[PDB]
Design a protein around this ligand. Structure first.
Ligand code: F3S
Ligand code: NA
Ligand code: NA
Length: 318
């Protein structure tokens, strides 16, 4: 019948990711490779491999970093402890933590100083969650599921504040929050919430269109949580979905009998990888008719690069 490819917007790079990439690229222009980055700068192998070629090196052990040298913190943020270590080595700290991850770090410190205990909804082994946790480790409690909620116990007078990983499924998050609120009715949180505009926007747009479709293709890396949550958002809405890093990974057999495809991409996914899908699917032998699907207009934040890094740039151009 009628074959259609719904190319969805918004999709692809968020501002935290573009800022983080530009931060690394701009360091490489100024200072001589190698440029050391703590953890993968964003969770996309294609982006990271390109930077490795250009002279970046992603490390987990700060001893792999020469004293006095540049170290960049990834978009996902970092534990405070890592920082004090950096200063001991007199490193040039260049912090590309996403402002909306920093937002969570900041509320956590602020509420802990007000003697709240903090509930952190997110996945225990995600670098973002670990980094946020370590801002107030002795008064924070991570929950990744509703079992963890049942286990929480606090005196009745104890003030509680919850916060979340920025890239959760809005559906799962709401589930856990609802259970949290049942148990702790007076629990407080960030008014604007912790789940970022990019996560909300990409899931919201996909959710609106996926139910007209037979298959959802999400372009992105399996190491990316928000990519995985896009796939999940489609599945719990009963439309099969797959996460693919690149067109080469597409098993073209799964397109047999699918006439309508919802196509989107994660916040860490380069637009070129998504275009290769559009090119493959809208041309022979597949001939899906291309249509755009627009969720609400996304307002792209006007974040600048890290200020100390900008100061450097200003100098050198003298
Ligand atoms: S937290 Fe920041 S890095 Fe992107 S996915 Fe959200 S804007
Ligand atoms: Na603490
Ligand atoms: Na705020």
């Amino acid at each position: 019948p009628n074959k259609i490819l719904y190319l969805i917007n918004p999709r692809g790079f968020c501002k935290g990711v573009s800022r983080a990439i530009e931060t690394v690229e701009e360091c490489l222009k100024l200072f001589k490779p190698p440029i050391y980055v703590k953890h993968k700068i964003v969770h996309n192998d294609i982006v990271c491999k390109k930077l490795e070629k250009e002279g970046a090196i992603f490390i987990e052990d700060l001893n792999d970093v020469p004293d006095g040298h540049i170290l960049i913190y990834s978009a996902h943020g970092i534990s405070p402890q890592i920082r004090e270590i950096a200063k001991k080595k007199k490193l040039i700290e260049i912090d590309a933590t996403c402002p909306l991850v920093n937002k969570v770090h900041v509320y956590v410190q602020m509420k802990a100083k007000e003697n709240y205990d903090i509930i952190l909804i997110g996945y225990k082994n995600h670098v973002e969650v670990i980094g946020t946790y370590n801002e107030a480790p002795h008064c924070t409690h991570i929950v990744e599921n509703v079992n963890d909620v049942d286990k929480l116990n606090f005196p009745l007078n104890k003030k509680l504040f919850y916060v979340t990983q920025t890239t959760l499924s809005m559906d799962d998050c709401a589930l856990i929050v609802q259970k949290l609120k049942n148990k702790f009715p007076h629990i407080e949180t960030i008014p604007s919430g912790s789940i970022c505009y990019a996560t909300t926007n990409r899931q919201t747009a996909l959710n609106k269109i996926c139910t007209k479709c037979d298959l959802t293709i999400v372009v992105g890396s399996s190491s990316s949580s928000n990519a995985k949550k896009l796939v999940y958002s489609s599945q719990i809405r009963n439309v099969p979905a797959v996460l693919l890093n690149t067109v080469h990974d597409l098993d073209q057999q799964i397109l047999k009998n699918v006439n309508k495809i919802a196509l989107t991409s994660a916040a860490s996914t380069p637009e070129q990888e998504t275009q290769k899908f559009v090119n493959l699917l809208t041309n022979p032998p597949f001939n899906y008719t291309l249509q755009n699907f627009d969720g609400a207009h996304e307002n792209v934040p006007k974040w600048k690069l890290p200020k100390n890094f900008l100061h450097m740039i200003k100098e050198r151009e003298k």
